[PDB]
Design a protein around this nucleic acid. Structure first.
Ligand SMILES: [Mg+2]
Ligand SMILES: [Mg+2]
Ligand SMILES: [Mg+2]
Ligand SMILES: [Mg+2]
Ligand SMILES: [Mg+2]
Ligand SMILES: [Mg+2]
Ligand SMILES: [Mg+2]
Ligand SMILES: [Mg+2]
Ligand SMILES: [Mg+2]
Ligand SMILES: [Mg+2]
Ligand SMILES: [Mg+2]
Ligand SMILES: [Mg+2]
Ligand SMILES: [Mg+2]
Ligand SMILES: [Mg+2]
Ligand SMILES: [Mg+2]
Ligand SMILES: [Mg+2]
Ligand SMILES: [Mg+2]
Ligand SMILES: [Mg+2]
Ligand SMILES: [Mg+2]
Ligand SMILES: [Mg+2]
Ligand SMILES: [Mg+2]
Ligand SMILES: [Mg+2]
Ligand SMILES: [Mg+2]
Ligand SMILES: [Mg+2]
Ligand SMILES: [Mg+2]
Ligand SMILES: [Mg+2]
Ligand SMILES: [Mg+2]
Ligand SMILES: [Mg+2]
Ligand SMILES: [Mg+2]
Ligand SMILES: [Mg+2]
Ligand SMILES: [Mg+2]
Ligand SMILES: [Mg+2]
Ligand SMILES: [Mg+2]
Ligand SMILES: [Mg+2]
Ligand SMILES: [Mg+2]
Ligand SMILES: [Mg+2]
Ligand SMILES: [Mg+2]
Ligand SMILES: [Mg+2]
Ligand SMILES: [Mg+2]
Ligand SMILES: [Mg+2]
Ligand SMILES: [Mg+2]
Ligand SMILES: [Mg+2]
Ligand SMILES: [Mg+2]
Ligand SMILES: [Mg+2]
Ligand SMILES: [Mg+2]
Ligand SMILES: [Mg+2]
Ligand SMILES: [Mg+2]
Ligand SMILES: [Mg+2]
Ligand SMILES: [Mg+2]
Ligand SMILES: [Mg+2]
Ligand SMILES: [Mg+2]
Ligand SMILES: [Mg+2]
Ligand SMILES: [Mg+2]
Ligand SMILES: [Mg+2]
Ligand SMILES: [Mg+2]
Ligand SMILES: [Mg+2]
Ligand SMILES: [Mg+2]
Ligand SMILES: [Mg+2]
Ligand SMILES: [Mg+2]
Ligand SMILES: [Mg+2]
Ligand SMILES: [Mg+2]
Ligand SMILES: [Mg+2]
Ligand SMILES: [Mg+2]
Ligand SMILES: [Mg+2]
Ligand SMILES: [Mg+2]
Ligand SMILES: [Mg+2]
Ligand SMILES: [Mg+2]
Ligand SMILES: [Mg+2]
Ligand SMILES: [Mg+2]
Ligand SMILES: [Mg+2]
Ligand SMILES: [Mg+2]
Ligand SMILES: [Mg+2]
Ligand SMILES: [Mg+2]
Ligand SMILES: [Mg+2]
Ligand SMILES: [Mg+2]
Ligand SMILES: [Mg+2]
Ligand SMILES: [Mg+2]
Ligand SMILES: [Mg+2]
Ligand SMILES: [Mg+2]
Ligand SMILES: [Mg+2]
Ligand SMILES: [Mg+2]
Ligand SMILES: [Mg+2]
Ligand SMILES: [Mg+2]
Ligand SMILES: [Mg+2]
Ligand SMILES: [Mg+2]
Ligand SMILES: [Mg+2]
Ligand SMILES: [Mg+2]
Ligand SMILES: [Mg+2]
Ligand SMILES: [Mg+2]
Ligand SMILES: [Mg+2]
Ligand SMILES: [Mg+2]
Ligand SMILES: [Mg+2]
Ligand SMILES: [Mg+2]
Ligand SMILES: [Mg+2]
Ligand SMILES: [Mg+2]
Ligand SMILES: [Mg+2]
Ligand SMILES: [Mg+2]
Ligand SMILES: [Mg+2]
Ligand SMILES: [Mg+2]
Ligand SMILES: [Mg+2]
Ligand SMILES: [Mg+2]
Ligand SMILES: [Mg+2]
Ligand SMILES: [Mg+2]
Ligand SMILES: [Mg+2]
Ligand SMILES: [Mg+2]
Ligand SMILES: [Mg+2]
Ligand SMILES: [Mg+2]
Ligand SMILES: [Mg+2]
Ligand SMILES: [Mg+2]
Ligand SMILES: [Mg+2]
Ligand SMILES: [Mg+2]
Ligand SMILES: [Mg+2]
Ligand SMILES: [Mg+2]
Ligand SMILES: [Mg+2]
Ligand SMILES: [Mg+2]
Ligand SMILES: [Mg+2]
Ligand SMILES: [Mg+2]
Ligand SMILES: [Mg+2]
Ligand SMILES: [Mg+2]
Ligand SMILES: [Mg+2]
Ligand SMILES: [Mg+2]
Ligand SMILES: [Mg+2]
Ligand SMILES: [Mg+2]
Ligand SMILES: [Mg+2]
Ligand SMILES: [Mg+2]
Ligand SMILES: [Mg+2]
Ligand SMILES: [Mg+2]
Ligand SMILES: [Mg+2]
Ligand SMILES: [Mg+2]
Ligand SMILES: [Mg+2]
Ligand SMILES: [Mg+2]
Ligand SMILES: [Mg+2]
Ligand SMILES: [Mg+2]
Ligand SMILES: [Mg+2]
Ligand SMILES: [Mg+2]
Ligand SMILES: [Mg+2]
Ligand SMILES: [Mg+2]
Ligand SMILES: [Mg+2]
Ligand SMILES: [Mg+2]
Ligand SMILES: [Mg+2]
Ligand SMILES: [Mg+2]
Ligand SMILES: [Mg+2]
Ligand SMILES: [Mg+2]
Ligand SMILES: [Mg+2]
Ligand SMILES: [Mg+2]
Ligand SMILES: [Mg+2]
Ligand SMILES: [Mg+2]
Ligand SMILES: [Mg+2]
Ligand SMILES: [Mg+2]
Ligand SMILES: [Mg+2]
Ligand SMILES: [Mg+2]
Ligand SMILES: [Mg+2]
Ligand SMILES: [Mg+2]
Ligand SMILES: [Mg+2]
Ligand SMILES: [Mg+2]
Ligand SMILES: [Mg+2]
Ligand SMILES: [Mg+2]
Ligand SMILES: [Mg+2]
Ligand SMILES: [Mg+2]
Ligand SMILES: [Mg+2]
Ligand SMILES: [Mg+2]
Ligand SMILES: [Mg+2]
Ligand SMILES: [Mg+2]
Ligand SMILES: [Mg+2]
Ligand SMILES: [Mg+2]
Ligand SMILES: [Mg+2]
Ligand SMILES: [Mg+2]
Ligand SMILES: [Mg+2]
Ligand SMILES: [Mg+2]
Ligand SMILES: [Mg+2]
Ligand SMILES: [Mg+2]
Ligand SMILES: [Mg+2]
Ligand SMILES: [Mg+2]
Ligand SMILES: [Mg+2]
Ligand SMILES: [Mg+2]
Ligand SMILES: [Mg+2]
Ligand SMILES: [Mg+2]
Ligand SMILES: [Mg+2]
Ligand SMILES: [Mg+2]
Ligand SMILES: [Mg+2]
Ligand SMILES: [Mg+2]
Ligand SMILES: [Mg+2]
Ligand SMILES: [Mg+2]
Ligand SMILES: [Mg+2]
Ligand SMILES: [Mg+2]
Ligand SMILES: [Mg+2]
Ligand SMILES: [Mg+2]
Ligand SMILES: [Mg+2]
Ligand SMILES: [Mg+2]
Ligand SMILES: [Mg+2]
Ligand SMILES: [Mg+2]
Ligand SMILES: [Mg+2]
Ligand SMILES: [Mg+2]
Ligand SMILES: [Mg+2]
Ligand SMILES: [Mg+2]
Ligand SMILES: [Mg+2]
Ligand SMILES: [Mg+2]
Ligand SMILES: [Mg+2]
Ligand SMILES: [Mg+2]
Ligand SMILES: [Mg+2]
Ligand SMILES: [Mg+2]
Ligand SMILES: [Mg+2]
Ligand SMILES: [Mg+2]
Ligand SMILES: [Mg+2]
Ligand SMILES: [Mg+2]
Ligand SMILES: [Mg+2]
Ligand SMILES: [Mg+2]
Ligand SMILES: [Mg+2]
Ligand SMILES: [Mg+2]
Ligand SMILES: [Mg+2]
Ligand SMILES: [Mg+2]
Ligand SMILES: [Mg+2]
Ligand SMILES: [Mg+2]
Ligand SMILES: [Mg+2]
Ligand SMILES: [Mg+2]
Ligand SMILES: [Mg+2]
Ligand SMILES: [Mg+2]
Ligand SMILES: [Mg+2]
Ligand SMILES: [Mg+2]
Ligand SMILES: [Mg+2]
Ligand SMILES: [Mg+2]
Ligand SMILES: [Mg+2]
Ligand SMILES: [Mg+2]
Ligand SMILES: [Mg+2]
Ligand SMILES: [Mg+2]
Ligand SMILES: [Mg+2]
Ligand SMILES: [Mg+2]
Ligand SMILES: [Mg+2]
Ligand SMILES: [Mg+2]
Ligand SMILES: [Mg+2]
Ligand SMILES: [Mg+2]
Ligand SMILES: [Mg+2]
Ligand SMILES: [Mg+2]
Ligand SMILES: [Zn+2]
Lengths: 71, 59, 204, 118, 5, 131, 122
RNA sequence: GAAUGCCGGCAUGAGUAACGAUAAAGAGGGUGAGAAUCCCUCUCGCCGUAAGCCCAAGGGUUCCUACGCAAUGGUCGUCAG
RNA sequence: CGAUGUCGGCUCGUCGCAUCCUGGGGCUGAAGAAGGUCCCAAGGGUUGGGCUGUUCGCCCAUUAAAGCGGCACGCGAGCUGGGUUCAGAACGUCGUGAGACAGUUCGGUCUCUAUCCGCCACGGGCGCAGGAGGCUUGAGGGGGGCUCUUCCUAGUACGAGAGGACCGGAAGGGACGCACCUCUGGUUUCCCAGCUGUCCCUCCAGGGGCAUAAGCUGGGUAGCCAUGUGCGGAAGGGAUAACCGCUGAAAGCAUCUAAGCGGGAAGCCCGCCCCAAGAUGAGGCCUCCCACGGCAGCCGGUAAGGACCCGGGAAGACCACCCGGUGGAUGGGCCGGGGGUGUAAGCGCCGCGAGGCGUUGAGCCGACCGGUCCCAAUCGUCCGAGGUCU
């Protein structure tokens, strides 16, 4: 988590007064590689931060499992 | 706009404080040297018709 | 801290060393010393200068006495030059040699009621894209409930110009003592025919 | 701002204001004296003075110049043969404006008369 | 008019 | 005071009277003192006078020319001391005082528009016939 | 007076025809470029097999402007177009020829090789 | 004494916004207690596939003349549907 | 919940400092140059673009830097309305269906008049123990406060080399500000010319109306202006922050400290520019008038003065301010110059003619610099002290 930055921000699309004022959207950046994941699937910044980190790892894992395959 | 409106009725004291600047000033009037009638300065006298010592128009 | 009273003649340019020099011309002298402020008497030092001769039929009795107590023929303009005690009792353009730097004070041109764009260089409004009757308007003038007021000194429309303005560190391009003319490089506040003050510069 | 601008506007556009000066020139040269508002009077002075001066010149060009504004050869003939002779030795200022004392009832307009000089 | 929904 | 006469007085120590009169449409060659890094040479600039804006001593005239493919206009203060001399190369006859319209014309069309001012050419030839 | 979006002719034989200004290389936020100022530009139009090609991000010094340049002797000069010579980071021209006149200002600003190669300096 | 109560009267905003197409006015003469505003004359401007002329609907004396100006006329009024 | 309008943008700022830059520092695994890290510091500054409704983020090109936050996630009786957030329509999906969706897609009415506080400007009143005309002191406010590049020192110190200073001294910029209009560049509603159609005067010639609230076109003075010109940021004095000391105990040594003294920042106080005595603490100076008549009061008539009225004004919404009022150059005219336009009409000549040439830089000609009493500022009216007490 020290080479990972987490951005929060307003989401997109529907939600009335809620979507207008809520920092529910999450970005997660793996700072060395630069690969990111965004998520606004739910209205919760927490559930979205969790689903984004999970995907960032799963993606980084595949990149790591793939450079090994090449080797 | 959103239609500004008076928030409170203006008081008798305060509406009249506003009109404290409304009095008329009486009209500046000088005597006509010819016929001694009162008239505004710098105009032909509407009574005898004189200005600058001579007659200028029929009254 | 020499100074003199003067009238703005107009602008032109001269060529000095193969260069155009934008100059304002000032008719400065001659300025009869009318009263000297002393510390023993007034608490500070300054010289009250006179400028432009006046038709004595126009100078009322309190002023005629003032002029008389000095030996001066009635002058139109009385103005002081702070911290200046000339030796003689007449101040002329010769207190300035070409190459000195001066500060010049004048009454700027009056814009009257001036909009927020002309007065404060505000960006104004858009002119298309739906802008609604706000093309030269100031926009927000505040916040909301905190502080719930508008700051003192907030830039708004209102009168602009016709105020004291000193332009500083102007060059003295030439001095024509024959005609009490002063050439100065640059721009000087106010209109042609306006009354100005030319002091020694305060820059170093 | 209005710095050093000559010319009233009298709340008219360019062609109406010109026509106003022309129709007042016609009335004035016609009757010798007209009553109008004070501002209009003050502006008619120079507009008419100039026309009289061209009449004092008498040449055909001058007449053709005057007719651009006055358009009435009879009236222009009156100007060239009766009015203009009276001013041969007067050096401008063929017109005068004297303010009246009473105002129009319906709008309060200060009035004045404009007339040709002796 | 615009709405608080 | 006479403020205009004071200005005229100030300006009068700089006024030239050695330059020939010329009109818009005349072709003219200005010999202009130009500093080049170090020294001062006289670089000529010849072209049609497309404009003369008059303000007494503050009069400037604008000279147009095409130079190696590109049009060049050069503005000169008429009383500048940087001007060595002006030579009248041709007298052209215009019908207006500002010839900006020749920026959009061909060479052929300009020749059609500013024909030789025969009258002022005979004036220029009847002069110098003073020996 | 050249700013971003401004199109300039190319007065050299690099193969560039038209560059479009995208930056005035004059301090933090200069609004305009005049004669002698370096700009950055993208090459919008070029000719085949030239050094530069359509799309490069090059530098260039303005040599001719349509807004008149003013001068201390009280004169002014005006050109019919906006022109620039494409240069390298050491400020030297990259072509081998300069087409058309150039402003004498370029001399007093370090562009002698450009002033040298130009057919006329005004 | 309160019901965004009911009826009426009178205030505040205020001498404020406005006085209904930016086709446009000016003078002279007349009338009258009173005239920017009514009548007459000359000048100017506007419409002219109309902002002119004639029908049909609808309206219902608004038509013409004399006498009038409290109210109606967004001002005035001697004028007027 | 008998309504506290909700994203983003625009505009306008203001504050915080956990400081992005610039200033001052200590430590460095600081040779130099360049960094790292922390401390002091909020004065000023903190760019333009591509994508997206975006906030956010990525990217391009720069930069000294491209700071993070608060102010109802500042600011819709300031604007916007792309998104959100009605009714229409469609897709995917769910539902037998009517319909549904922090799913998508195209569309979809944002209210002329400010009463009070506040703010920006401008007056009226009264006060400032006599009444007046001038000139001023500056308590206290406000404005401003940025920075880079190159060159010299010096290719020196340092460094194997590459690279490359401190200190000090020049010059040139960017942005911002105030003023100005000589130049550059605008505008310039009638200042000049040209042109069409039509109607008209008067047939030709010459003109006038209308084609916009200039018919169109080419130009264009003053003025107002920036893209144009001048000038500003300081210098300098003083007190400080972190930090570094001198002398020096307690505590025989040591210690910047306990006694005392010094150095030290773009910051702080002063300095600069502007406002300012309603500064009711109502200041100072110079000059003027002056103990008038009638029972700290009232009433009269005057004083020095002032106002009214008028001609005006790069002053101005009204007001105010400034100038002038026949003892006068204030506005209008007239004259001379400037300036614009660019060779009027009429005539003569050449051409069958459209036209051309000459008379001619002619004629016309706002505002600019001036002169000139030709025209108008006639003639006047009113207000205005006699000074309380200790
Ligand atoms: Mg963190
Ligand atoms: Mg959201
Ligand atoms: Mg979207
Ligand atoms: Mg929904
Ligand atoms: Mg929330
Ligand atoms: Mg609104
Ligand atoms: Mg609105
Ligand atoms: Mg609206
Ligand atoms: Mg309303
Ligand atoms: Mg209430
Ligand atoms: Mg009220
Ligand atoms: Mg009440
Ligand atoms: Mg009441
Ligand atoms: Mg009130
Ligand atoms: Mg009462
Ligand atoms: Mg009122
Ligand atoms: Mg009264
Ligand atoms: Mg000299
Ligand atoms: Mg002045
Ligand atoms: Mg002024
Ligand atoms: Mg003004
Ligand atoms: Mg301003
Ligand atoms: Mg501006
Ligand atoms: Mg803007
Ligand atoms: Mg903008
Ligand atoms: Mg704008
Ligand atoms: Mg608009
Ligand atoms: Mg709208
Ligand atoms: Mg609005
Ligand atoms: Mg609009
Ligand atoms: Mg504005
Ligand atoms: Mg606004
Ligand atoms: Mg609120
Ligand atoms: Mg709000
Ligand atoms: Mg509060
Ligand atoms: Mg003022
Ligand atoms: Mg300097
Ligand atoms: Mg003199
Ligand atoms: Mg002054
Ligand atoms: Mg004066
Ligand atoms: Mg204005
Ligand atoms: Mg205006
Ligand atoms: Mg004037
Ligand atoms: Mg006019
Ligand atoms: Mg009007
Ligand atoms: Mg009107
Ligand atoms: Mg009106
Ligand atoms: Mg018209
Ligand atoms: Mg008539
Ligand atoms: Mg009669
Ligand atoms: Mg009448
Ligand atoms: Mg009238
Ligand atoms: Mg004849
Ligand atoms: Mg009168
Ligand atoms: Mg009157
Ligand atoms: Mg009425
Ligand atoms: Mg009436
Ligand atoms: Mg002058
Ligand atoms: Mg040619
Ligand atoms: Mg031709
Ligand atoms: Mg021809
Ligand atoms: Mg000829
Ligand atoms: Mg090319
Ligand atoms: Mg190629
Ligand atoms: Mg391509
Ligand atoms: Mg391509
Ligand atoms: Mg090249
Ligand atoms: Mg070329
Ligand atoms: Mg009860
Ligand atoms: Mg009820
Ligand atoms: Mg009820
Ligand atoms: Mg009843
Ligand atoms: Mg009722
Ligand atoms: Mg009721
Ligand atoms: Mg009632
Ligand atoms: Mg009422
Ligand atoms: Mg009511
Ligand atoms: Mg009321
Ligand atoms: Mg009122
Ligand atoms: Mg109101
Ligand atoms: Mg109002
Ligand atoms: Mg209303
Ligand atoms: Mg109204
Ligand atoms: Mg209406
Ligand atoms: Mg109407
Ligand atoms: Mg209409
Ligand atoms: Mg309209
Ligand atoms: Mg119409
Ligand atoms: Mg009207
Ligand atoms: Mg008439
Ligand atoms: Mg009438
Ligand atoms: Mg009538
Ligand atoms: Mg009548
Ligand atoms: Mg009437
Ligand atoms: Mg009546
Ligand atoms: Mg009638
Ligand atoms: Mg027809
Ligand atoms: Mg019927
Ligand atoms: Mg009916
Ligand atoms: Mg009936
Ligand atoms: Mg009635
Ligand atoms: Mg009646
Ligand atoms: Mg009635
Ligand atoms: Mg009756
Ligand atoms: Mg009625
Ligand atoms: Mg009525
Ligand atoms: Mg009505
Ligand atoms: Mg009657
Ligand atoms: Mg009838
Ligand atoms: Mg609620
Ligand atoms: Mg309610
Ligand atoms: Mg409520
Ligand atoms: Mg409500
Ligand atoms: Mg409410
Ligand atoms: Mg700190
Ligand atoms: Mg720092
Ligand atoms: Mg540092
Ligand atoms: Mg450090
Ligand atoms: Mg180092
Ligand atoms: Mg530290
Ligand atoms: Mg700061
Ligand atoms: Mg964008
Ligand atoms: Mg694009
Ligand atoms: Mg974006
Ligand atoms: Mg995003
Ligand atoms: Mg740096
Ligand atoms: Mg960086
Ligand atoms: Mg950016
Ligand atoms: Mg902020
Ligand atoms: Mg908010
Ligand atoms: Mg925000
Ligand atoms: Mg908001
Ligand atoms: Mg609000
Ligand atoms: Mg709104
Ligand atoms: Mg909003
Ligand atoms: Mg509201
Ligand atoms: Mg609001
Ligand atoms: Mg509100
Ligand atoms: Mg929408
Ligand atoms: Mg929309
Ligand atoms: Mg509904
Ligand atoms: Mg389906
Ligand atoms: Mg089911
Ligand atoms: Mg199904
Ligand atoms: Mg199922
Ligand atoms: Mg669903
Ligand atoms: Mg949906
Ligand atoms: Mg969602
Ligand atoms: Mg959607
Ligand atoms: Mg779709
Ligand atoms: Mg649509
Ligand atoms: Mg939608
Ligand atoms: Mg509305
Ligand atoms: Mg109010
Ligand atoms: Mg309140
Ligand atoms: Mg208030
Ligand atoms: Mg007061
Ligand atoms: Mg006293
Ligand atoms: Mg006084
Ligand atoms: Mg003072
Ligand atoms: Mg102070
Ligand atoms: Mg205070
Ligand atoms: Mg201060
Ligand atoms: Mg500073
Ligand atoms: Mg070296
Ligand atoms: Mg050394
Ligand atoms: Mg080296
Ligand atoms: Mg240095
Ligand atoms: Mg600032
Ligand atoms: Mg200022
Ligand atoms: Mg400014
Ligand atoms: Mg100015
Ligand atoms: Mg200005
Ligand atoms: Mg100019
Ligand atoms: Mg000028
Ligand atoms: Mg100008
Ligand atoms: Mg110009
Ligand atoms: Mg005309
Ligand atoms: Mg004909
Ligand atoms: Mg015609
Ligand atoms: Mg007609
Ligand atoms: Mg018509
Ligand atoms: Mg029309
Ligand atoms: Mg049109
Ligand atoms: Mg016309
Ligand atoms: Mg034009
Ligand atoms: Mg122009
Ligand atoms: Mg102009
Ligand atoms: Mg101009
Ligand atoms: Mg200006
Ligand atoms: Mg500029
Ligand atoms: Mg010891
Ligand atoms: Mg020791
Ligand atoms: Mg101590
Ligand atoms: Mg110390
Ligand atoms: Mg030391
Ligand atoms: Mg110190
Ligand atoms: Mg500094
Ligand atoms: Mg002061
Ligand atoms: Mg006082
Ligand atoms: Mg004072
Ligand atoms: Mg008290
Ligand atoms: Mg006291
Ligand atoms: Mg106090
Ligand atoms: Mg006291
Ligand atoms: Mg005092
Ligand atoms: Mg004192
Ligand atoms: Mg006064
Ligand atoms: Mg006035
Ligand atoms: Mg006033
Ligand atoms: Mg006024
Ligand atoms: Mg006076
Ligand atoms: Mg008098
Ligand atoms: Mg008097
Ligand atoms: Mg005069
Ligand atoms: Mg005069
Ligand atoms: Mg005088
Ligand atoms: Mg006048
Ligand atoms: Mg001329
Ligand atoms: Mg000819
Ligand atoms: Mg002719
Ligand atoms: Mg002819
Ligand atoms: Mg002819
Ligand atoms: Mg023949
Ligand atoms: Mg011809
Ligand atoms: Mg001329
Ligand atoms: Mg004419
Ligand atoms: Mg003349
Ligand atoms: Mg003349
Ligand atoms: Mg004239
Ligand atoms: Mg001038
Ligand atoms: Mg005289
Ligand atoms: Mg009298
Ligand atoms: Zn009388």
């Amino acid at each position: 988590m020290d080479e990972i930055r987490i951005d929060v921000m307003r989401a997109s699309g529907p939600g009335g007064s809620g979507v207008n004022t809520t920092d529910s959207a999450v970005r997660v950046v793996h700072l060395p590689t630069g690969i990111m994941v965004t998520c606004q699937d739910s209205r919760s910044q927490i559930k979205n931060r969790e689903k984004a980190l999970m995907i960032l790892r799963s993606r980084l894992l595949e990149m790591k499992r793939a450079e090994e395959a090449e080797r | 706009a959103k239609h500004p409106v008076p928030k409170k009725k203006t008081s008798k004291a305060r509406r009249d404080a506003r009109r404290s600047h409304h009095a008329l000033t009486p009209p500046t009037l000088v005597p006509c040297p010819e016929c001694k009638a009162m008239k505004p300065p710098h105009t032909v006298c509407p009574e005898c018709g004189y200005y600058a010592g001579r007659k200028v128009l029929e009254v | 801290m020499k100074g003199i009273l003067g009238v703005k003649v107009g602008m032109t340019r001269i060529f000095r060393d193969d260069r155009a020099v934008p100059v304002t011309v000032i008719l400065a002298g001659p300025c009869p010393v009318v009263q000297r402020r002393t510390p023993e008497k007034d608490g500070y030092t300054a010289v009250q200068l006179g400028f432009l001769p006046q038709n004595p039929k126009r100078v009322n009795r309190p002023l005629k006495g003032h002029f008389a107590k000095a030996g001066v023929e009635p002058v139109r303009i009385l103005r002081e030059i702070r911290d200046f005690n000339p030796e003689g009792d007449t101040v002329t353009v010769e207190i300035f040699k070409p190459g000195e730097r001066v500060d010049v004070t004048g009454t700027s041109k009056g814009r009257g009621f001036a909009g927020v764009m002309k007065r404060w260089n505000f960006a104004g409004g858009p002119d298309s894209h739906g802008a609604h009757k706000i093309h030269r308007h100031p926009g927000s003038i505040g916040n909301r409930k905190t502080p719930g007021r508008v700051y003192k000194g907030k830039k708004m429309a209102g009168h602009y110009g016709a105020e004291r303005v000193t332009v500083m560190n102007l060059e003295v391009v030439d001095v024509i003592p024959e005609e009490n003319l002063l050439l100065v490089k640059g721009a000087v506040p106010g209109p042609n025919g306006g009354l100005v003050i030319v002091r020694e510069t305060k820059k170093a | 701002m209005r710095h050093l601008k000559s010319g009233r506007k009298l709340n008219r556009h360019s062609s109406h204001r010109l026509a106003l000066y022309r129709n007042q020139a016609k009335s004035l040269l016609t009757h010798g004296r007209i009553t109008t508002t004070v501002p209009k009077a003050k502006e008619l002075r120079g507009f008419v003075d100039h026309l009289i001066h061209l009449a004092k010149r008498g040449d055909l060009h001058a007449r053709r110049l005057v007719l651009r504004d006055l358009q009435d050869v009879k009236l222009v003939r009156k100007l060239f043969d009766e009015i203009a002779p009276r001013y041969r030795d007067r050096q401008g200022g063929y017109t005068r404006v004297l303010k009246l004392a009473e105002r129009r009832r319906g709008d309060g307009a200060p009035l004045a008369l404009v007339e040709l000089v002796e | 008019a615009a709405a608080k929904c | 005071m006479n403020r205009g006469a004071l200005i005229k007085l100030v300006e009068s120590r700089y006024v030239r009277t050695d330059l020939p009169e010329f009109r818009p449409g005349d072709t003219v060659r200005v010999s202009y003192k130009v500093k080049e890094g170090n020294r001062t040479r006289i670089q000529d600039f010849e072209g049609i006078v497309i404009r003369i804006r008059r303000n007494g001593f503050n009069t400037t005239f604008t000279v147009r020319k095409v130079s190696y493919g590109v049009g060049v206009e050069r503005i000169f203060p008429l009383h500048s001391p940087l001007i060595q001399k002006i030579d009248i190369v041709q007298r052209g006859r215009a019908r207006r005082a500002k010839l900006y319209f020749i920026r959009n014309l061909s060479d052929r069309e300009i020749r059609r528009k500013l024909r030789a001012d025969r009258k002022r050419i005979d004036q220029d030839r009847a002069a110098e016939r003073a020996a | 007076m050249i700013q971003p979006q401004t199109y300039l002719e190319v007065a050299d034989n690099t193969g560039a025809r038209k560059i479009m200004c995208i930056r005035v290389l004059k301090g933090s936020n200069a609004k305009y470029a005049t004669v002698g100022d370096v700009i950055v530009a993208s090459v919008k139009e070029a000719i085949p097999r030239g050094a530069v090609k359509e799309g490069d991000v090059v530098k260039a010094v303005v040599v001719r402007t349509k807004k008149e340049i003013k001068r201390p002797d009280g004169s002014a000069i005006r050109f019919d177009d906006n022109a620039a010579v494409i240069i390298n980071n050491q400020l030297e021209p990259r072509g081998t020829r300069v087409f058309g006149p150039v402003a004498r200002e370029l001399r007093e600003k370090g562009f002698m090789k450009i002033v040298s190669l130009a057919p006329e300096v005004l």
